[PDB]
């Protein structure tokens, strides 16, 4: 009787809201995502295939303004020692293996959207899925979570078996080292989650000593697997059946929350962390460069013959080495805010209390300052187009510091996804309550309620 | 008919753009000063007025392109193309000013022609105008910033320059040389515009939150024959919504719309009478208090005396470069520098 | 009936003067602590040292300053991004000298401004309305995210980032132009056109109803009176208002149906300001509006003055004068 198709007047949806003809169509929704996952994979190779051939290996990696090649060099596809790049051929083959893998992911999203069946469900009793047969909808999350945790164990078999992951805490700058003991002990790694989200402590962001990262994806792989075979074998519970809406959009409005939740935290891994994202490949953070500005002017005035300590500043406070509120001797000036800085350089200046003046004189080597002199000129400070440094400085060098140039571009997207989560939760709660199209003419629910005053 | 009624039967026809018997002042004077402005961004320039390169021909990419001003040593003379200064020459005219004179004047003369226009269609459909009453917001901004601000001060170089960044200079002019923030006549205007921006946002929400859904479809934009006497939003559920959440609620559907007229129009009118105080620079940058123990007392430490030294950061830094009329040149240790920066 | 359903069934009930329901359970305590602390910090808070050296800057009405000049005067540079509650202070005099009551009216206020955004949803489910007003309130709750929390995270300390007060709001803007250049930035310039359009579209649609209103009274009384609240007949004819604003501009320039018009009043200011609030969220990570300084130049190579360097000669002067003690080093990249 029906079988109208895709018009304005069979489904009640217009040319905009241009998917909601595929809420109930099971088969063509699969052709939506496979054409979309073919499109994410298409960008994932062709950006790196554009990043290589706009690459120069002699110039440092953050200089040319590229954001995927520092993701590859954290896993260590051919980085020698100290952040020099020895081989660019593993960077080339990883994108062509994404460029060719988009075409076979592109055939699915055009077969399942055009030629393939419209009634995905009605088939061999496998896919079908009535956003309301709960036992079936948990099996979809169970099929993904045994594959999500198996991609979680693909990092540790990269780190513990094939070569090794890059490590900025290596002696001699930074180097790939094959990690031989990740941490299993949950009182420090699940103890990351029970920490303060503020400065100092740093809840999920300050995650130094790289063998706790590889301890993460052992512990995130062995929970997503054990969560994956939970949702195959059982059903949702009794309280979950009456607490969680249970329909199409909303059953898809929960991914806009924990997501917008994900790229809030990913807009802080790329902004504060110095061990999951190395500064030799991404560039320095805001905390690193402001310590580095104070550090190169210290060792200049140390080499210019001037007792560091005894120097009061312009203000009464110490110009170089004052003390933080809790006793660790830190760098002076405006760098009291980044007193929690724990980069790889100046960790050989950390004493028991902090920046210790037995070793702050007579243990600055010429490698240490020329790294911090590099991060001082390469601070996260840019224009829209290219121009780095402060804005009252003229345009000379062009550099956007792709820590900062990536942190905002997820925060545009992490804010926007909290909107449409909240916007889809409105149409969610009005899906099962039947007033998605507005109030009734005759049975108005306000008139049953009494007067306020 | 007569001689004049045949003309009045012409301009009040149902042509697709309505030409208007008041439109003969508009349509010359509004194609000029749009298209007078659009040559001043591209072709004619500054650098003979106050030493700036502000055209597409010199190559600035529209976020610093503007038809500027006349010079400061030139007074308040309406550079007239055929005027004393003009000497009937296109060049130099624009190079020494013009435009901005031309565009400013013609724009001012139109805005009359548009507010005459919406009065004129309001009688033809018989509609009781308030758009012309609500255009007194926009016309009192233009004649009191681009017209009556420079005529209190020196000549039209200190008038704002027509561009996006030429306005942005005139912004940071009014921060430093006048403190146009924190005088109270500007601060009602921020209550006017931001209060106006809520009342169209919050009224745009609730008509899309209380609907009848007469149609059997899904799209909410359908089922609304314009010739429909029954009202499409509730106002009984919307009053019940806002009496609970905010505690106060519009308990009748008129004066919900009169308040949306009133809240940005009286915002601009209070903002319009502030810059006429700035025209004779009755600035109210200074407080009569809070300064004598900024002089006697270094222990008295407040945001306002922090803010008043920031305006000294304007007035001795950009003023040699903003106004090369006086040739102000500064020897680099007379400028207020705070520290190492 | 049940003891807990007598609660869960009082709090979610509609017949109350304000809705206390489940988002209000976080809101009503944790916003009203920020109300009580705001009136007391405005009046008698001891000065707090914004600059992070020593200098206790006063913003309370007992210490000689006006209501324009008063502030909550935000927390110190020395604490940084530390959680500094009232109990990790050794004394409350140590709290209030070193940035105490600012963070009490930030973390309480930002919780209380988000649960309002949930509470505006919650009654629209508890009535028959279609719930799309939490997304409309997601625009000035984002402005509360940016300059209170989000910009103060990425810049460093909790020192920078107040609006708290009146002159301290104007001091915060003039440094955000000075430090990292609000003005020539395409999210803020898109954002003010939403507000300026939202200035006009308030005064446009609000005029055009008050224009095209039907006759139901006489001249001597008010014309706001003759109908009753809750009537079903539309007080102004929409066909007359459409062919007047149509007659003004052209015929297809005006919305033939009013239900599409009210989406556009709830689009143009609300899409605008969360671009402007994603200017400051983009400005948190020092991704600033672009510099056209020294752009045009002679074939000699001599510099040519633009408006942009004239903005910069104003912008460098606020940068060379702000925070007049704390800079010991030639760049302000902290």
């Amino acid at each position: 009787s029906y079988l109208g198709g895709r018009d304005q007047e069979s489904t009640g949806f217009a040319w905009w809201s241009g998917n909601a003809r595929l809420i109930n169509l099971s088969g063509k929704l699969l052709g939506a995502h496979v054409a979309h996952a073919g499109l994410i994979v298409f960008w994932a190779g062709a950006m790196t295939l554009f990043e290589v051939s706009h690459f120069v290996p002699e110039k440092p990696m953050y200089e040319q303004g590229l954001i995927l090649l520092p993701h590859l060099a954290t896993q260590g596809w051919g980085v020698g020692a100290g952040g020099e790049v020895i081989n660019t051929f593993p960077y080339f083959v990883v994108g062509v293996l994404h460029l060719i893998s988009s075409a076979v992911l592109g055939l699915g999203g055009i077969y399942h959207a055009v030629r393939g069946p419209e009634v995905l469900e009605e088939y061999s009793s496998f896919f079908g899925y009535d956003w309301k047969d709960k036992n079936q909808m948990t099996n979809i999350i169970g099929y993904h979570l045994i594959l999500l945790g198996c991609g979680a164990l693909l990092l540790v078999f990269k780190a513990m078996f094939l070569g090794g992951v890059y490590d900025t805490w290596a002696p001699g700058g930074g180097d790939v080292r094959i990690i031989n003991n990740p941490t299993l002990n949950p009182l420090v790694i699940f103890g990351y989650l029970l920490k303060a989200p503020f400065g100092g402590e740093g809840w999920m962001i300050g995650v130094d000593n790289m063998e706790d990262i590889i301890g993460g994806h052992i512990w995130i792989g062995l929970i997503c697997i054990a969560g994956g075979v939970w949702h195959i074998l059982t059903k949702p519970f009794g309280w979950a059946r009456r607490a969680f809406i249970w329909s199409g959009e909303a059953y898809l409005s929960y991914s806009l929350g924990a997501l917008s939740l994900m790229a809030f935290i990913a807009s802080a891994f790329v902004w504060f962390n110095n061990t999951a994202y190395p500064s030799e490949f991404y560039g320095p953070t805001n905390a690193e460069a402001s310590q580095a500005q104070s550090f190169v002017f210290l060792v200049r005035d140390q080499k210019l013959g001037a007792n560091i300590g005894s120097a009061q500043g312009p203000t009464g406070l110490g110009k170089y080495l004052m003390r933080s509120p809790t006793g660790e001797i830190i760098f002076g000036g405006e760098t009291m805010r980044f007193w929690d800085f724990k980069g790889p350089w100046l960790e050989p200046l950390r004493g028991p209390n902090g920046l210790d003046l037995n070793k702050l004189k007579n243990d600055i080597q010429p490698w240490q300052v020329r790294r911090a002199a590099e991060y001082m000129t390469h601070a996260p400070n840019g224009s829209i187009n290219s121009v780095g440094g402060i804005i009252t400085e003229a345009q000379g060098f062009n550099y956007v510091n792709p820590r900062a140039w990536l942190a905002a571009s997820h925060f545009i997207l992490a804010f926007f996804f909290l909107i449409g989560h909240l916007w889809h939760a409105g149409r969610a709660r009005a899906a099962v309550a039947g007033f998605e199209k507005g109030i009734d003419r005759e049975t108005e629910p306000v008139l049953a309620m009494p007067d306020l005053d | 008919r007569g001689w004049f009624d045949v003309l009045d039967d012409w301009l009040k026809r149902d042509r697709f753009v309505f030409v208007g018997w008041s439109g003969i002042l508009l349509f010359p004077c509004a194609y000029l000063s749009i298209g007078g402005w659009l040559t001043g961004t591209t072709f004619v320039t500054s650098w003979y007025t106050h030493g700036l390169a502000s055209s597409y021909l010199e190559g600035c990419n529209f976020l610093t392109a503007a038809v500027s001003t006349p010079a400061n040593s030139l007074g308040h003379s309406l550079l007239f193309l055929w005027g004393p200064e003009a000497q009937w020459d296109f060049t130099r005219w624009c190079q020494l000013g013009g435009l901005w004179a031309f565009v400013a004047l013609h724009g001012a003369f139109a805005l009359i022609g548009f507010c005459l226009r919406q009065l004129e269609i309001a009688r033809l459909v018989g509609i009781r105008p308030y758009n012309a009453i609500a255009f007194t917001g926009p016309i009192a901004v233009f004649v009191s910033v681009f017209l009556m601000y420079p005529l209190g001060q020196s000549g039209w170089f200190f008038a704002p320059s027509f561009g996006v960044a030429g306005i942005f200079r005139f912004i940071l002019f009014f921060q430093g040389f006048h403190n146009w923030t924190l005088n109270p006549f500007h601060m009602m205007g921020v209550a006017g515009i931001l209060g106006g921006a809520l009342l169209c946002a919050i009224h745009g929400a609730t008509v899309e939150n209380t609907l009848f859904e007469d149609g059997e479809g899904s799209n909410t934009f359908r089922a609304f024959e314009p010739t429909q006497a029954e009202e499409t939003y509730s106002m009984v559920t919307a009053n019940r919504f806002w009496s609970q959440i905010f505690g106060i609620a519009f308990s009748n559907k008129r004066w919900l719309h009169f308040f949306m007229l009133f809240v940005p129009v009286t915002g601009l009118w209070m903002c319009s009478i502030g810059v006429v105080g700035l025209a004779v620079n009755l600035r109210a940058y200074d407080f009569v208090s809070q300064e004598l123990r900024a002089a006697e007392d270094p222990e008295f430490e407040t945001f306002y005396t922090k803010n008043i030294l920031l305006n000294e950061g304007i007035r001795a830094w950009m003023a040699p470069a903003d106004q090369p009329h006086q040739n102000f040149v500064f020897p680099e240790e007379v400028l207020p520098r705070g520290n190492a920066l | 009936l049940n003891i807990w359903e007598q609660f869960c069934g009082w709090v979610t009930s509609t017949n109350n003067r304000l809705y206390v329901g489940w988002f209000g359970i976080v809101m009503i305590p944790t916003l009203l602590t920020a109300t009580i602390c705001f009136v007391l910090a405005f009046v008698a808070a001891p000065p707090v040292d914004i600059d992070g050296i020593r200098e206790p800057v006063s913003g309370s009405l007992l210490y000689g300053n006006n209501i324009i000049t008063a502030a909550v005067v935000p927390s110190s540079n020395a604490i940084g991004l530390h959680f500094y509650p009232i109990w990790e202070a050794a004394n409350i005099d140590e709290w209030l000298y070193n940035g105490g009551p600012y963070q009490l009216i930030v973390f309480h206020f930002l919780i209380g401004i988000f649960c309002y955004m949930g509470r505006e949803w919650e009654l629209s489910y508890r009535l028959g309305m279609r719930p799309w007003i939490a997304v409309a309130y997601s625009a000035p709750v984002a402005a509360a995210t940016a300059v209170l929390l989000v910009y103060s995270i990425g810049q460093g300390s909790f020192s920078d980032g107040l609006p708290l007060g009146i002159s301290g709001t104007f001091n915060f803007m003039l440094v955000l132009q000075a430090e990292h250049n609000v003005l020539m930035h395409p999210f803020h310039m898109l954002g003010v056109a939403g507000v300026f359009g939202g200035a006009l579209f308030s005064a446009m649609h609000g005029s055009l109803v008050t224009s095209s209103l039907v006759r139901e009274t006489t001249e001597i009384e008010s014309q706001n009176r003759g109908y009753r609240f809750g009537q079903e007949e539309e007080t102004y004819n929409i066909v007359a208002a459409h062919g007047y604003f149509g007659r003004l501009i052209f015929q297809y320039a005006s919305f033939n149906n009013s239900r599409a018009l009210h989406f556009f009043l709830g689009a143009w200011p609300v899409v605008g300001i969360w671009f402007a609030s994603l200017a400051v969220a983009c400005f948190a990570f020092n991704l600033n509006g672009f510099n056209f300084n020294h752009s045009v130049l002679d074939s000699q190579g001599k510099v040519l003055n633009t408006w942009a360097d004239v903005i910069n000669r104003a912008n460098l002067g606020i940068e060379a004068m702000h925070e007049r003690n704390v800079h010991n080093f030639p760049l302000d990249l902290a």
């Binding site: 007067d451 306020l452 005053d453 | 009984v236 009053n239 009496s243 505690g247 106060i248 308990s251 009748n252 208090s289 | 003067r17 009046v43 009405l61 007992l62 006006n66 209501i67 009753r228 609240f229 809750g230 009537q231």
Partner: peptide
């Protein structure tokens, strides 16, 4: 003197913020 002049007009504005919430007239439908 001036310090009580601000606190007077502040809390007299805040008193109407209490009175308009509680003692709003009831709207009646007809």
């Amino acid at each position: 003197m001036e310090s009580v002049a601000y606190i007077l007009v502040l809390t007299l504005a805040l008193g109407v913020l209490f009175f308009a919430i509680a003692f709003r007239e009831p709207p009646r439908i007809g």
